């Protein structure tokens, strides 16, 4: 599937923090319709 970093945030008593997920819809997202770096995934697999 395409890549969709769904961004959101949270507030704890006082301050805030960020949060990201691959499977959510809170509608502020960064998406890309191409991986183009799977060779790097294979590289990391070979390493591990």
């Amino acid at each position: 599937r395409p890549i969709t970093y769904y961004f959101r945030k949270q507030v704890i008593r006082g301050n805030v923090y960020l949060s990201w997920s691959w499977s959510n819809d809170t509608s502020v997202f960064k998406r890309v319709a191409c991986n183009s770096s799977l060779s790097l995934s294979s590289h990391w697999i070979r390493l591990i």
Binding site: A33, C34, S36, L38, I45
Partner: protein, 1858 residues
């Protein structure tokens, strides 16, 4: 009572006032005070009254309206016929047919080169259709009108009645005369009856009157049209249509209609023509990559203006733009581009233009200053970074600075700060008091300043001339005269006076003059300033161009054409690539009055920074203050000045002002460079903050931005469109930012006129379409016979402009055949005109025209082909088309003539060649030896040399006998010194025996005598001569030219010089010809031409029969790529190779000024640099050079103790990179050169025995490039066949046999320091003499290989790291890591030595990068510095060459190394491997180095043994010992010693510090640590290959005692695949199968990688195979891999690699690529059982072509074997390529008879798309099929390895898949 003419072509501006005033005089009255009183105008007025007592006067038209009638008349008669044009073109074609055999030479050289000849015939182009038709009536009328106006202009520019009688004698039935008056009439059926009244012309039918300039305009345009259409006719190839000629006739007639019904006002329409063509070109570009978004509003702008000019001006503009849009091709549109001057030039309205200029300049603004502050802060940051880099020393003064500033510690420690610090001070660098950096010279050479620039007047003489005269235009004074009257320049004192105020109020005048041929009714205005002001501007701009511009790269002002092309190619990579990996936009910015709108408040702080760095203040600033405080006037009208004794008070200032007393602005042609600097800085700021990888190009007005963007190789449609959206977004953002900045500086940018594209670019009327430099031919063929200003119409000059125009066309183009044919045609045309009439000869020739049969043939051949050196003085040989800046034209000519001699059977050509062999030598006395000083590589000839020498000598005579009448004392004494010592010094120079002439020339020009000769060659203007000297010089020069042309025609009609047999080995002839000319043996000049020492016919690597038998035959290899496209849409992947080009022949891509010399003292120092090359130290010539430089200085000069090195192992025609060196000009456009690589490593065989051949390779490369490109484009089948040229002459090749010069004669010089100050006193800055230590000797050739390769490595590393630590340009040159040293060296010791050298280089970089906190962490600093050096070394290309020697590969891959996956092993992976080995050497094995006490001495070599590198090397070694001799943190004493070393390298490395400050402290600081631990050698590294380095060290090691390494495999799976005809289809199978997924788990479990990890998959199939095949054919794979596994399994197996090359531009310059690394990892036995590894690239790799498969069959036949296995592993997602692959593989297997097994890798998804055509297209020889799958395959992938098998002779015509 005599004046010259000096006016033939239209160079002057154009104007209507003279005609108007003459009309007002003709009506009634006396002359109205503004008429340029002369005798000619008086007699003209007399005759004009005597014929204008008629009645037409009163309804007469004038200029600005006169043309109106004329153009109408012309189009009328142009479509009518006559009885005159027939005769003219009949005679012209008769001349051509009489000159037809000439072309035979051309055809013969092309047939010797191996190319076809166009059979139509260039030179008989006027006999196919040129008669009785519309196009031939328009051509003949055009030519006839040109002839008419030529005769008119000759009568006008004649002098005496005798010339006019001569003219009328020639033309009788055309002209008529009325004596008793000067009343000459010229009739014609078109133009009626003109009355050329000496200096005026009148037309009766077209009832008007006008002056000479209009006649020149019309003559020029008719000539342009004629010669353009002529060369357009009969071309070799269908580059153009024939509707180009028809459309161009239509276009010209449309322009005629426009002019005839819209007046001069219609000249805005061509101003719209040009951008219309540009828009059409762009809109024809985007069709190839139409998926990107084109920006801007250029086409909307064009459409709006066309509709405007259609509504106004009538429908004529509509017809014009319609006929313009009629064109469809691209080259036709460019041919329309070039003719924006083929219609005329407009009568300007100076008053209107000056009013607009006044308003545009006085328009005040409200601009910002903080932007300029940030901009100048950026500039100062850049200049200080550069200063620190080159000279490791800041340029501040903490005495004046604050303390709460991070730079007081970053200055107490001489470092550079990081990013966050510079961000903390990002806009405050002005608050730093930057001190002087670039010392200015106390004098300068006159060649850089003096020029015929028409120096203005000053206020005193202006007021006096106004009080005296009653009116008229100003004649301005001249520059050389003012210079000879006043004292010379002392720029230090001048600028100090300006720093003290200075430039008093009197010398602030400027005058305007209207520019020429600019096509604007308002008209441009170029200015002429006063003496002091012009001096200011000139020295300032030269100062910047020398020491500032090199920092910036956009700044294309002081650059030649080759460097322009290099820059364009660098900034266009990403245009027309066929993919989406390189998108480059191009924004052409053209401001609105950039010069005028540039104003004071902008350029204050930038100019202030420049002024601080030169040690001045407010000086540059004062510029606009001068424009505020200065008078400005117009030259062509003086009566309007009414000066009030305080200011101007101009008159008539209601119809439009003319003068004024001040202006806030600037003018064109002034301070282009500083204004370009500020604009460029703005652009760079905006881009760099938005996009960092932008490149810029700027001459000041026509700016170009180029942002590049990279997008991934494999991308999908959605992601691709997303990327392109972001791309357009960023580009639009940058354009908006530029406009914001420009409005922040007052520079308004036109939004609807800035041009944008992505597959187009323009620079200075040079169009670049998809990386291809597209040529306009029309400008250059239009300039035929349009000689330059202040020149004479000689045969030589017109033939020279023809030749150089054609050669610049070739440099802008390809396919040299076309410019050669045009050269022929235009030359014949020009000489036909010149022989029709010769002005300086004052009559017709009658010796050449009357000839017939053969003699006229010999005459033309001698006129055109013979060179100026070989008897003739007019022509040029075709050998100058190969290269332009060749070192010796003699060899070129002789080679050409030899080839034409032995390649023929006719008679007269033999006579011509024999003439060229013995060119009638003359005397051998003085007054001829001087020629060798002005132009060496020439011959003492009976008949004189080029007239430059004659002018120099005549002006020398006039200046010697009139030295007393030059006021200045210095120039007087210099000429006095000249007279005597010139003869005596020439005697001494002849007293030098070996006669190396280049040295003598440079010595003559480097002594004091270069001063007078310099200015004497700077005299080239007739009026300059007439002003300075008297009629004697002018008359003598005219008589000399008369005699010279007489002797010239006599030479061109000499006796045939009866033949004497052909000659061998031309260059030898040239040498002995020089010998018998000047007596003694000559050296240097004799350089061979590649046309002789490379053979004529090249041959492909296939079918050459050389192979490896007969011997180590040398060759020049040419690897062509399969991407070759003869069309203009691809640009190739590559860059090209053109070479260098020195800018000393007026080829700067403009013509404003030149760069002739620099200085005599610097030339003398260059000689001192070249003392030991061919002269011994203790000799007379060394004594002479020292005496010379001590004469041009004081006896208290700190001489440099000239060096103690010896480059005995080197050439002799590589003297200096000043005037001729670095041979190569790349006469052909580099566009096709993007498809080509050219290697010379084969020629390494020449150094089998050494002998110091050392011949230049660049001409070889270039000749091969040119003619192989021509031979490819004439046969498009061999798109991948690597060629190789063999040598033909061995006697050309010259062992240097190094030689020396010496004499017994000594000559004493006179003092020139107490006799000439202000010229020589302070030209060059200090030198900071260093004391030598005698550099204890080496004793080198007593060791073995393993004992010294360590030393060689350490030396190379040390030198490289030094040249990197100080930012020299020689950090990326191949002279450091040569290639004749890896083949014989111990690899382990070599690499460990490299490590040692890199380490001590890190020591010096540590000494530099030393802040106050890094001291307490020095070990990490050392490591990081080593890493920095290794990074720069990764950026070094040519290191990867060492991977050719298998020993080095074994030693470098013995350690674990990341293996690459590309066949064309690039810089990246190779250098990564080398650096991984080096990083493994360090950090594991550092103890082995710096120990083993007989490895510690540091042996330095003598490749760069100058004083600079020397002390730096000793410093590096000392600092390395001091970083060593330490394990814990440092101590303060160590820090003190290190700071002292830093100060010492600061002192030696230029700057503005004290010289050394001691000698005893120096020796005490360097002794016991470096001096007795270096062993210097007097030898270069290369020649070491002779003695011991050449002795190979046999590696007597075997192995490391490891087991048998038993081999392994894994599981598999079989699948069935049957076939039949019908092939029905289901839907669910496609639905579940044709969905490509991707999920890498098992592609990562494939641990091993060689190319992609495929042998894992191809083990089991072959383990199942049961033949043990002898012969595999692997194809499509990248590297090794599958092949390597094949060689593992079957030992008795061999291989045919069909791996694709796909070369990239990251490779080396010439050398050939290297084999795939995977196989070289295998071993010696596995490699030898490969067929041929060092000869793969010579073979093709184009799977889609047939020649590859013919090569396979050829291998099968040459080897006693037959194919058994085939493997195909080409991964492709496309369709057509794999279809072609399968077609040819099927025809191959059908062309095999024996048993066969084939393996095909495929993807199941394509196995159901019916457009695949794989099984139904391949299954035409194989009945047996089985599919195979592996246990290691991508986790979700339809990968199938299908295995076919057959036994022989099966067809199975076609079968689809069931």
């Amino acid at each position: 009572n005599i004046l010259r003419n000096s006016d033939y072509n239209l160079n002057s501006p154009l104007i209507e006032d003279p005609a108007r005033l003459m009309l007002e005089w003709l009506k009634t009255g006396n002359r109205p005070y503004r008429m340029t009183l002369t005798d000619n105008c008086s007699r003209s007025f007399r005759v004009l009254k005597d014929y204008f007592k008629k009645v037409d006067l009163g309804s007469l038209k004038v200029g600005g309206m006169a043309a109106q009638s004329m153009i109408s008349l012309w189009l009328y008669g142009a479509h009518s016929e006559s009885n005159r044009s027939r005769r003219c073109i009949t005679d012209l074609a008769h001349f051509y047919s009489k000159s037809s055999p000439i072309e035979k030479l051309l055809n013969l050289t092309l047939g010797n080169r191996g190319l076809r000849i166009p059979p139509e015939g260039v030179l008989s182009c006027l006999e196919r259709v040129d008669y009785d038709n519309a196009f031939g009536r328009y051509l003949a009328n055009t030519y006839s009108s040109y002839l008419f106006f030529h005769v008119i202009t000759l009568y006008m520019n004649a002098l005496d009645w005798d010339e006019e009688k001569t003219i009328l004698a020639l033309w009788k039935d055309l002209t008529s005369v009325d004596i008793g008056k000067d009343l000459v009439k010229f009739k014609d059926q078109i133009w009626g009856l003109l009355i050329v009244t000496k200096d005026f012309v009148y037309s009766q039918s077209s009832n008007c009157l006008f002056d000479r300039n209009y006649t020149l305009m019309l003559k020029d345009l008719f000539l342009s049209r004629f010669n353009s259409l002529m060369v357009l006719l009969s071309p070799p190839e269908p580059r153009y249509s024939d509707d180009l000629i028809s459309q161009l006739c239509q276009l010209y007639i449309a322009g005629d209609q426009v002019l005839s019904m819209c007046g001069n006002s219609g000249y805005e329409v061509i101003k719209i023509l040009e951008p219309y063509v540009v828009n059409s070109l762009v809109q024809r570009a985007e069709k190839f990559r139409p998926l990107i978004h084109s920006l801007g509003d250029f086409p909307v702008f064009i459409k709006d203006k066309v509709s405007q000019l259609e509504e106004t001006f009538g429908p004529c503009a509509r017809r014009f733009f319609r006929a313009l849009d009629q064109f469809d091709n691209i080259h036709d549109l460019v041919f329309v581009f070039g003719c924006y001057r083929h219609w005329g030039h407009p009568y300007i309205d100076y008053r209107k233009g000056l009013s607009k200029l006044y308003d545009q300049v006085h328009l005040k603004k409200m601009i910002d200053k903080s932007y300029q502050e940030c901009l100048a802060s950026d500039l100062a940051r850049r200049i200080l970074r550069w200063g620190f880099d080159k000279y490791s020393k800041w340029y501040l003064d903490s005495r004046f600075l604050a303390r709460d500033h991070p730079l007081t510690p970053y200055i107490k420690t001489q470092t550079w700060p990081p990013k966050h610090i510079v961000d903390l001070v990002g806009d405050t660098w002005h608050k730093l008091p930057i001190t002087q950096i670039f010392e200015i010279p106390e004098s300068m050479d006159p060649s850089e300043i003096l020029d015929d620039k028409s120096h203005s007047f000053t206020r005193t003489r202006l007021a006096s001339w106004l009080s005296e005269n009653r009116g008229g235009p100003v004649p301005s004074e001249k520059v050389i005269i003012t210079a000879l009257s006043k004292p010379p320049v002392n720029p230090r004192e001048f600028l100090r006076s300006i720093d003290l105020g200075g430039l008093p109020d009197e010398d602030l005048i400027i005058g305007l003059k209207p520019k020429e041929r600019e096509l604007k009714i308002e008209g441009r205005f170029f200015a002429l300033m006063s003496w002091n002001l012009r001096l200011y501007f000139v020295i300032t701009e030269k100062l910047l161009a020398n020491y500032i511009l090199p920092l910036f790269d956009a700044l294309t002002m002081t650059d030649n054409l080759n460097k322009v092309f290099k820059k364009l190619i660098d900034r266009v990579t990403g245009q027309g690539l066929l993919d989406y990996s390189r998108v480059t936009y191009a924004f052409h910015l053209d401001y609105e009055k950039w010069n005028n709108h540039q104003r004071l408040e902008s350029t204050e702080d930038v100019f202030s920074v420049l002024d601080q760095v030169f040690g001045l203040k407010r000086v540059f600033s004062r510029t606009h203050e001068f424009f505020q405080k200065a008078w400005i006037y117009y030259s062509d009208r003086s009566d309007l000045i009414g000066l009030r004794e305080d200011q101007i008070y101009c008159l008539d200032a209601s119809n439009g002002p003319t003068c004024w007393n001040g202006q806030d602005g600037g003018l064109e042609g002034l301070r282009q460079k500083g204004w370009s600097l500020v604009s460029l800085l703005m652009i760079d700021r905006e881009s760099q903050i938005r996009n960092t990888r932008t490149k810029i190009l700027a001459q000041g007005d026509n700016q170009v931005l180029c942002p590049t963007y990279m997008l991934s190789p494999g991308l999908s449609q959605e992601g691709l469109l997303y990327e392109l959206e972001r791309i357009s977004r960023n580009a639009l953002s940058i354009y908006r930012a530029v406009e914001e900045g420009a409005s922040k500086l007052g520079l308004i940018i036109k939004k609807e006129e800035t041009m944008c594209s992505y597959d187009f670019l323009i620079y200075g009327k040079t169009p670049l379409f998809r990386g291809n430099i597209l040529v306009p031919e029309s400008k250059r063929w239009a300039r035929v016979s349009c000689v330059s200003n202040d020149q004479i119409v000689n045969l030589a000059n017109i033939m020279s402009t023809v030749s150089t125009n054609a050669l610049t066309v070739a440099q802008h183009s390809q396919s040299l055949i076309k410019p050669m044919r045009d050269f022929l045609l235009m030359s014949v045309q020009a000489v036909f005109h010149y022989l029709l009439f010769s002005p300086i000869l004052k009559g017709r020739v009658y010796k050449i025209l009357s000839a017939e049969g053969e003699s006229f043939l010999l005459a033309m051949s001698r006129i055109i082909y013979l060179d100026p050196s070989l008897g003739g003085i007019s022509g040029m040989s075709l050998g100058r088309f190969h290269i332009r800046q060749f070192s010796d034209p003699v060899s070129e000519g002789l080679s050409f003539w030899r080839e034409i001699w032995l390649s023929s059977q006719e008679s007269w050509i033999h006579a011509l060649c024999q003439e060229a062999g013995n060119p009638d030598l003359g005397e051998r006395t003085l007054e001829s030896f001087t020629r060798l000083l002005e132009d060496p590589t020439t011959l003492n000839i009976r008949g004189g040399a080029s007239p430059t020498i004659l002018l120099k000598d005549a002006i020398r005579k006039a200046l010697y006998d009139e030295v007393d009448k030059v006021e200045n004392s210095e120039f007087r004494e210099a000429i006095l010194l000249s007279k005597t010592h010139r003869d005596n010094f020439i005697l001494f120079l002849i007293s030098v025996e070996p006669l190396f002439p280049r040295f003598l020339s440079e010595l003559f020009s480097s002594s004091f005598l270069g001063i007078p000769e310099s200015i004497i060659g700077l005299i080239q203007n007739s009026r300059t001569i007439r002003r300075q000297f008297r009629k004697s010089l002018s008359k003598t020069l005219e008589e000399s030219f008369y005699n010279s042309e007489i002797h010239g025609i006599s030479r061109m009609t000499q006796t045939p010089q009866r033949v004497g047999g052909v000659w061998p080995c031309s260059s030898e002839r040239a040498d002995l010809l020089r010998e018998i000319s000047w007596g003694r043996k000559v050296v240097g000049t004799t350089v061979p031409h590649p046309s002789e020492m490379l053979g004529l016919l090249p041959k492909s690597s296939i079918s050459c029969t050389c192979g490896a038998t007969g011997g180590g035959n040398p060759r020049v290899s040419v690897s062509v790529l399969p991407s070759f496209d003869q069309s203009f849409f691809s640009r190739g992947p590559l860059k090209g190779y053109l070479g260098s080009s020195t800018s000393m022949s007026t080829q700067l891509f403009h013509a404003w000024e030149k760069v002739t010399n620099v200085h005599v003292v610097k030339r003398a120092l260059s000689l001192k640099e070249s003392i030991n090359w061919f002269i011994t130290r203790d000799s007379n010539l060394a004594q002479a050079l020292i005496r010379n430089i001590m004469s041009l200085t004081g006896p208290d000069f700190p001489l440099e103790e000239a060096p103690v090195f010896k480059r005995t192992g080197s050439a002799l025609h590589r003297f200096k990179s000043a005037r001729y060196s670095e041979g190569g000009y790349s006469s052909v456009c580099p566009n096709l050169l993007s498809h080509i690589s050219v290697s010379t490593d084969t020629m390494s065989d020449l150094t089998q025995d050494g002998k110091n051949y050392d011949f230049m390779f660049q001409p070889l490369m270039l000749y091969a490039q040119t003619w192989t490109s021509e031979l490819v484009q004439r046969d498009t089948r061999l798109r991948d066949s690597t060629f190789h040229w063999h040598l033909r002459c061995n006697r050309c090749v010259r062992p240097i046999d190094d030689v020396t010069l010496e004499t017994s004669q000594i000559f004493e010089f006179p003092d020139v320091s107490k006799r000439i100050s202000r010229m020589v006193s302070g030209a060059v800055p200090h030198f900071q003499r260093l004391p030598d230590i005698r550099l204890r000797p080496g004793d080198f050739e007593s060791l073995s290989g393993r004992e010294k390769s360590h030393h060689i490595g350490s030396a190379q590393g040390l030198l490289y790291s030094i040249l990197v630590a100080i930012h020299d340009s020689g950090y990326n040159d191949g002279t450091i890591f040569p290639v004749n040293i890896y083949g014989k060296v111990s690899p382990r010791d070599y690499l460990r030595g490299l490590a040692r050298g890199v380490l001590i280089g890190s020591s010096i970089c540590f000494l530099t990068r030393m802040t106050n906190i890094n001291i307490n962490r020095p070990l990490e600093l050392v490591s990081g510095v080593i890493s920095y050096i290794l990074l720069r070394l990764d950026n070094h290309p040519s290191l990867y060459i060492m991977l050719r020697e298998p020993s080095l590969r074994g030693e470098i891959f013995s350690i674990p190394q990341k293996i690459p996956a590309a066949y064309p092993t690039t810089m990246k992976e190779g250098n990564r491997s080398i650096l991984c080995y080096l990083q493994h050497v360090l950090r594991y094995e550092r103890e082995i180095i710096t120990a083993s006490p007989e490895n510690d001495w540091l042996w330095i070599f003598s490749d760069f043994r100058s004083a600079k590198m020397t002390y730096l090397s000793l410093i590096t070694y000392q600092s390395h010992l001091l970083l060593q001799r330490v394990e814990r943190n440092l101590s303060k004493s160590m820090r003190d010693n290190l700071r002292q070393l830093s100060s010492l390298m600061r002192q030696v490395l230029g700057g503005h510090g004290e010289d050394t400050l001691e000698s005893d402290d120096n020796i005490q600081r360097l002794l016991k640590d470096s001096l007795r631990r270096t062993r210097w050698v007097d030898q270069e590294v290369r020649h070491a290959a002779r003695t011991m380095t050449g002795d190979y060290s046999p590696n007597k090691k075997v192995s490391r005692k490891v087991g048998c390494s038993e081999w392994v495999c894994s599981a598999q799976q079989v699948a069935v695949s049957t076939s039949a005809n019908p092939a029905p289809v289901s839907e669910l199978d496609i639905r579940a199968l044709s969905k490509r997924f991707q999920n890498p788990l098992i592609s990562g479990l494939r641990v091993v990688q060689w190319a992609t990890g495929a042998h894992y998959k191809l083990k089991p199939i072959l383990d199942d195979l049961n033949v043990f095949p002898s012969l595999c054919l692997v194809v499509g794979d990248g590297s090794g891999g599958i092949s390597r596994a094949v060689l593992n399994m079957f030992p008795d197996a061999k291989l045919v690699f069909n791996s694709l090359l796909e070369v990239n531009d990251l490779m080396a310059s010439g050398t050939h690529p290297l084999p795939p690394s995977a196989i070289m990892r295998g071993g010696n036995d596995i490699v030898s059982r490969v067929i041929d590894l060092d000869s793969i690239w010579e073979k093709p790799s184009d799977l889609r072509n047939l020649a590859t498969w013919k090569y396979f069959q050829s291998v099968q036949k040459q080897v006693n074997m037959s194919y058994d296995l085939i493997i195909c592993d080409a991964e492709v997602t496309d369709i057509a390529s794999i279809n072609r692959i399968t077609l040819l593989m099927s025809d191959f297997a059908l062309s095999i008879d024996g048993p066969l097994y084939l393996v095909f890798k495929t993807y199941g998804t394509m196995l159901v798309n019916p457009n695949y055509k794989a099984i139904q297209h391949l299954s035409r020889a194989f009945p047996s099929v089985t599919g195979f799958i592996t246990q290691v395959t991508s986790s979700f992938s339809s990968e199938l390895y299908l295995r076919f098998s057959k036994r022989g002779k099966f067809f199975r015509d076609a079968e689809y898949l069931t």
